[model samples]
Target chain A: VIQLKRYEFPQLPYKVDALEPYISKDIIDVHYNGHHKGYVNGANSLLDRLEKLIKGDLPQGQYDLQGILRGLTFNINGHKLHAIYWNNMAPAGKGGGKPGGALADLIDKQYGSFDRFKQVFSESANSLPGSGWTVLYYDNESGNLQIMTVENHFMNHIAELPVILIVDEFEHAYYLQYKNKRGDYLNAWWNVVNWDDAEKRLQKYLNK
Target chain B: VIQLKRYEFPQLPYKVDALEPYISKDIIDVHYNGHHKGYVNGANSLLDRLEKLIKGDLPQGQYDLQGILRGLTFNINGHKLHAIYWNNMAPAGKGGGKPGGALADLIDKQYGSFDRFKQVFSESANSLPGSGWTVLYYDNESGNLQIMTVENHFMNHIAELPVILIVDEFEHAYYLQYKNKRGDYLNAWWNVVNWDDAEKRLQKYLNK
Candidate 1:
């Protein structure tokens, strides 16, 4: 009774070279093709496996059934996070400026200052353990912007919050370009942050 | 400005090896002493770091403040989950009987039957991709019982829900006794489940 469509890999809004010195072309190429695509493929494959299992074709073993669902959850979340990650960035000159309009006002009102917001968001990025992410989301219950961290593609999510900005802190995301310098990557990431897209996302939430 | 007491490793409700065959002495000893204690120490250490930062002793850098908070979050959640896990199990014959009283009625109402509840919980346990947990909680908003998973002690948590039962699926929890046989561990784990404790926790939530 479960029907799932093959989730597709999304196209980047900018060319691979667009992010330049902040995030290298090489990082984007491998990240988009190798990592993000791998998640997309992984999710799609799991959906197929789920379909088969639903039809009672696969043996229900202690390892197989549950393990498959776990894998599916991980891959699906991986795909979703990456897709959002891609959309939240733009070419350096095009997107690096501070947020404007309602987004800017809300941030200043909520966090006291734009610099404070950066400090909190960057802290999440630098401090995440292993392959993880730092997410800034709109908490519907509190009606406030909150920051949370996720380990791997799937874990430590603040359930029911709508994500506004996501920063990938995974080693694979920065290791090749920045090596052991996660601090440097965190500092530079702000240069390519797409505040317009963020504002649009926030606006949608606020409207509701 | 931030005051934190050193988080202590909780005393297990039962003696090590008390759950035998279903769970072994080596597993309990290592899990409680090594893993749970590690989280306690890690959290306490982070609190020390945070205290220093608050007193203006540490420089405000991209790597320091937010990063320390993230580390504290992971360790605190780790300590909290393990404490709950320790209290939620008992020796085989003393525990493992099906839920009775209000807990039994709720399980039947929410999941249809005790067998179905086990099946769903087992599926969540087996399918968790890596080190994680299957938590059954009382949802305050929906007023329904919900089952969710957490990865690496902190991730994939359902915010605002009060946990009634939690089952650890981390390798360190069962690897010494069960090794690659996660399924075997999960199947056997039910024998030591402390239904009385769960019922008490559920009763509090229901009263609220």
Candidate 2:
């Protein structure tokens, strides 16, 4: 059995409106208030019930270890990726443009240009088959950057990679802003790509 | 979202044929060598890859947090529940009948008699929808007993309860011996219910 842990809500990095044009305030509120917060509360609900059963703080009951573990993972993962996803971008004025420093250097080395990485990542996001996410993960051992896609709140992943840049690919992520036009959202999302925030995540992992 | 851990295979408690009449050697081998072992190896496979990505031991790639976390839970939970399920039963001579000590007393107090408790638990087992498990979990805080059901490898569980009795309700669990007759399997499974093994679990938890 694994350690039973709980998750806490992560606050929005900036006023919801600050991400406008690229992401609307309405979309941000709904995603964060509805989808994101739901994830946090849902996992905590499961945790409390689980803890009660483990300690017998409640009535005698059953706990299917497999079901509980998977359910928690589903809820918890939603919160985690959403946290990274929101912060991965910054306000219109303070975001976008290629990152400078080791991150940009790695991008250059791996994909020839930051423009190329964006092209590939955005296309990967738009091409996603269903509700999921896309991540630009850094390989600690290989010292390279690669892109990954996720389905639902879980599925398709490798171990131990530090995700520096994440884009929420779920329809709930951009449906209000761009509707069925995921391609339009992809083109606009670039304007708010917070290179500095992503760069910070890279440095922290490198320092580790 | 959580720690990346690997699971080891737990050895069988008795020879393949030792559970004859109640459970045959054919079923045991398929469940153990195939289903049980698959869980352990599947989880480990994910762990090694996850570790490799976390450490970048391979080429640049992707790691979706949601998918990886949920997948790990799925594989890992399979191994853990199976471990407990296996030890929950014993060979013919050592199993069946009522348990002694605190467990028997609790059963008596809760259900009037061990026979009554068995009647209720067995009925609950037969009532399961689809494939799943039934557990007799002990509430440490309430100091009572409750039963729970699980669907697939995950879903429907409480936290922190220490399971004292578990019956596998999967079709794969008894399909070979009992075929489609789940009632028959439920009847026969009691003949191999390891009260001592169940009692030992209760004692250990009480000591804690």
Model 2: interface root-mean-square deviation in Å = 12.5
Per-candidate local distance difference test: 0.75, 0.72
For residues A115-193, write the lDDT of model 2, one tens digit per residue: 7567657756865777877777675544656566666765544333567888787887789878888888878888898
- Tens digits of per-residue lDDT, candidate 1, B94-182, equal 88889998878877765667886787678767767788888886754335565666777667665445578888888888888889999
The C-alpha interface RMSD of every prediction is: 7.7, 12.5
Q: Candidate 2 chain B: minimum summed lDDT over ten consecutive residues — where?
A: B152-161
By TM-score, how accurate is candidate 1?
0.58
Looking at model 2, residue A118 earns an lDDT score of 73
